[PDB]
A paper describes a structure:
To gain structural insight into this dual binding potential, the crystal structure of HLA-A∗24:02 that was complexed with the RYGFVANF (RF8) peptide was also determined and compared with that of the lipopeptide-bound form. We also noted that the C-terminal Phe residue of the RF8 peptide was accommodated in the F pocket in a manner that was virtually identical to that for the C-terminal Phe residue of the Myr-GANF lipopeptide. The B pocket of HLA-A∗24:02 was able to accommodate either the long-chain fatty acid of the Myr-GANF lipopeptide or P2 amino acid residue (Tyr) of the RF8 peptide; therefore, we predicted that its pocket structure may be adaptively reorganizable in order to capture these chemically distinct anchors. In the peptide-bound complex, the hydrogen bond between Ser9 and His70 was maintained but modified in a way that supported a clockwise rotation of the χ2 dihedral angle of His70 at approximately 130 degrees. This rotary shift of the imidazole ring allowed exposure of its δ nitrogen atom (Nδ1), rather than Cδ2, to the B pocket surface, leading to the establishment of a hydrogen bond with the hydroxy group of the side chain of the P2 Tyr residue. Alternatively, HLA-A∗24:02 adopted a rather indirect strategy in which spatial shifts were induced not for Ser9 itself but for its hydrogen bond partner, His70. In contrast, rotation of the imidazole ring was induced upon peptide binding, resulting in exposure of the Nδ1 atom to the pocket surface to hydrogen bond with the P2 amino acid residue.
Residue numbers in the entry:
A (entry chain B): 0 to 99
B (entry chain A): 0 to 276
C (entry chain C): 1 to 8
Amino acid sequence: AIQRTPKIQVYSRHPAENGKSNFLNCYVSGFHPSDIEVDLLKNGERIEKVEHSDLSFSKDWSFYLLYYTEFTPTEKDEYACRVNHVTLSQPKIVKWDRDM
Amino acid sequence: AGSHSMRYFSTSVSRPGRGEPRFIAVGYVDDTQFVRFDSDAASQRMEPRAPWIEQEGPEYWDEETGKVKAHSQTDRENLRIALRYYNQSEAGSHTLQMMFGCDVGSDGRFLRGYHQYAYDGKDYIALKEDLRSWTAADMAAQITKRKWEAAHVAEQQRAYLEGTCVDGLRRYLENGKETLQRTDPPKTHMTHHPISDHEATLRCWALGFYPAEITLTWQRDGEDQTQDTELVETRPAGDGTFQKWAAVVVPSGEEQRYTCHVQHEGLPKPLTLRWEP
Amino acid sequence: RYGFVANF
Ligand SMILES: [Zn+2]
Ligand SMILES: [Zn+2]
């Protein structure tokens, strides 16, 4: 079996405007095999109401998933996505940057 | 759009000591998912995942349920057959993926058909473009290929791909017309991010586009910056549209050498963007 | 419209 490490993007659906409700996305792609754990974090803590898309895969057979939750960004709050996969020594935490 | 696809994707993963393999299948028209089946789910039914597929009546849901369940059972068998073919133990977990479906042009005619398997992420067997023979990747797959030749599987699949598949795709495009036929062009803009006194990042943005297919590239003095461009994978916004960006690191004062180029089916003509402070 | 598969 050949393994592939997840690519991770954390981003909002709409351009972030403090105080206005939005959606926070963590898109994980290019991984194999398919078992994976994904958490969205608010200031280091697990967000509860988090949905995700049905497992599918790309032309090279690697898998992708979208994790998402409604949220209202502010100046202070820090958001991140934490991903664990067999290819990772430890979970990878990717911080939300509103310009990426 | 100028052409359309219907694709089903399935993933079977064995769970040694934890019961039968997990089986997940999803159906797509272009980049829009419209059905799913998950062996973990209580319903044990094909379930809708787009509004327009709920136009289908009870016969559809019964028939599609029967078909995807037959597939799940055959792929559990196939995971077991692969263990024998590869002399692998019953202790290890393995994955079997299948993709099938068809492409049709905007005139409504068949363009291409697919029927292919991967085992543990590697190509196993695939129907070739002319739909008459098989690409089998290794020794094990030749055994399957011989069996599929004897049983005329390529003809069976050709008939499905040029018939039922095409007919299904056409119907879905009809029922989901208001959303499936859209070619929404990207909204584009550029941002500038100083890295230091010597360098800054230019990032070209494409937002709110459908379908997902897009080409976003940087040029410097009219030359492609293939090996210096950071290019993220096209990503879902969650509302039916997609996003992408491309960025280059540019020396200070050299921003006007750089242009961003956007090709998308919804664009009247390809775009060229320049940094405009 | 779903298709079908064969045994390995
Ligand atoms: Zn069209
Ligand atoms: Zn200096």
